[PDB]
């Protein structure tokens, strides 16, 4: 019922802060489950070796301050709320060819009564691709996308890949190319600023090969 979901959203957000990490002790690391969903190759520049892909950047974490009791709100166990209103780990795509960080659309999130969040915002990424020179009578190229939190480091927000591979379940195949291979690898990355404090990326790559 509308009335209960209205009240629910008000009650949840009266004393909410989107600025603080949703943790009880500030030593807790927020666990974010990350997954890249590849949807469609929408452009292929062979001169500059750039491919524009349509993706969704699927994210999952738990916000402890957004739990509720379903009996208080007519048995409602989930709501959709705008992603602008909540705290987010600020996971971004980079190694982008034209415009260094990828702009991701802010779709609504699925929230549930345990404070679980699922967010699957769409984006357009532009990879740079390396030509694979091992054996290419049939041409092959390797395109990769890095994911990581823009500001938070590994001792505040840990990103964890949901799978070893990018999700190709809603991937619309091409007429010219085929994805030979595709994996995700998580890395610990260190920067000059910060000897003691690591950062985290997940690099998804796919090798696209031309059909005969």
């Amino acid at each position: 019922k509308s009335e209960h979901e209205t009240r629910l959203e008000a009650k949840l957000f009266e004393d909410y802060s989107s600025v603080v990490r949703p943790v009880e002790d500030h030593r807790e690391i927020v666990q974010v489950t990350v997954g890249l969903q590849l949807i469609q190759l929408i452009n292929v520049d062979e001169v500059n070796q750039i491919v524009t892909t349509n993706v969704r950047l699927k994210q999952q974490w738990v916000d402890y301050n957004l739990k509720w009791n379903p009996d208080d709100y007519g048995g409602v166990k989930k709501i959709h709320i705008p992603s602008e209103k909540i705290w987010r780990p600020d996971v971004v795509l980079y190694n982008n060819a034209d415009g260094d960080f990828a702009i991701v659309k802010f779709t609504k999130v699925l929230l549930d009564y345990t404070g679980h969040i699922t967010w699957t915002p769409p984006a357009i990424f532009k990879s740079y691709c390396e030509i694979i020179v091992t054996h290419f009578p049939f041409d092959e190229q390797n395109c990769s996308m890095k994911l990581g939190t823009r500001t938070y480091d590994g001792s505040a927000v840990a990103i964890n890949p949901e799978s070893d591979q990018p999700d190709l379940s809603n991937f619309m195949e091409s007429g010219e190319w085929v994805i030979k291979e595709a994996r995700g690898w998580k890395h610990w990355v260190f920067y000059s600023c910060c000897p003691t404090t690591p950062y985290l990326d997940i690099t998804y790559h796919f090798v696209m090969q031309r059909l005969p």
Partner: antibody, heavy 120, light 107 residues
């Protein structure tokens, strides 16, 4: 200061409505929610429903059609009406002042109670 | 909803004793658990909420503890005016109450 009193007739004969009242003092009902609980005989307590601080209401889904909660903020009274009674609804009936954290609620205070028994 | 069972059902103990009531849940309660005292013919009084927060006014002899599924109320030195029934209750998944631990004094 923080007080609740539950008033209402001990006897109501079956297949009728039960009308209770919860007179309140120490606080305003506009800033504090008030719930209704009851304990059936030879059983545990259970939450019947709530009068929200914002005027609206929510009910135990099992009692949803029978119940209807209201209030009068000048009289400092919260009312209950519960139609279609029967022998299984025999027990003590309390109203409570609810405290909250974010969207979660719990029962902070109680009144003495009221025994309500259903026989012809 | 989460079913709750209190042990011991009936408890006998003398003044000054360190009694401990338990309250185990059928599912994870995640620390959202309260305790109240019910003397006969009197309004129930809240002792503890959120597992271990002492209610304002309540004696320091009452204390709470637990996590996940198992919870406990402790009365460190038993007074005579603590003779009552003690009910635990849960408030994240519906509103369910404990069966009841009745406290009787040795003499």
């Amino acid at each position: 200061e923080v007080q609740l009193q539950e008033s209402g007739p001990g006897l109501v004969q079956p297949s009728e409505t039960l009308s209770l009242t919860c007179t309140v003092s120490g606080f305003s009902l506009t800033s504090y929610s008030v719930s209704w609980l009851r304990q059936p005989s030879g059983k545990g307590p259970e939450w019947m429903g709530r009068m929200w601080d914002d005027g609206g209401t929510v009910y135990n889904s099992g009692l949803k059609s029978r119940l209807s909660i209201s209030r009068d903020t000048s009289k400092n009274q919260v009312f209950l009406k519960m139609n279609s009674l029967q022998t299984d609804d025999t027990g003590t009936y309390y109203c409570t002042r609810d405290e909250r954290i974010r969207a979660i609620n719990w029962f902070a205070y109680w009144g003495q109670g009221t025994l309500v028994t259903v026989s012809s | 909803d989460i079913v709750i069972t209190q042990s011991p059902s009936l408890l006998s103990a003398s003044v000054g004793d360190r009694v401990t009531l338990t309250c185990k849940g059928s599912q994870n309660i995640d620390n959202y658990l309260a305790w109240y005292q019910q003397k006969l013919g009197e309004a129930p009084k809240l002792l503890i909420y959120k597992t271990n927060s002492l209610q304002t006014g309540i004696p320091s002899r009452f204390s709470g503890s637990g996590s996940g599924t198992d919870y406990t109320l402790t009365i460190s030195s038993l007074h005579s005016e603590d003779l009552a029934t003690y009910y635990c209750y849960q408030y994240i998944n519906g509103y369910t109450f404990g069966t009841g631990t009745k406290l009787e004094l040795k003499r």
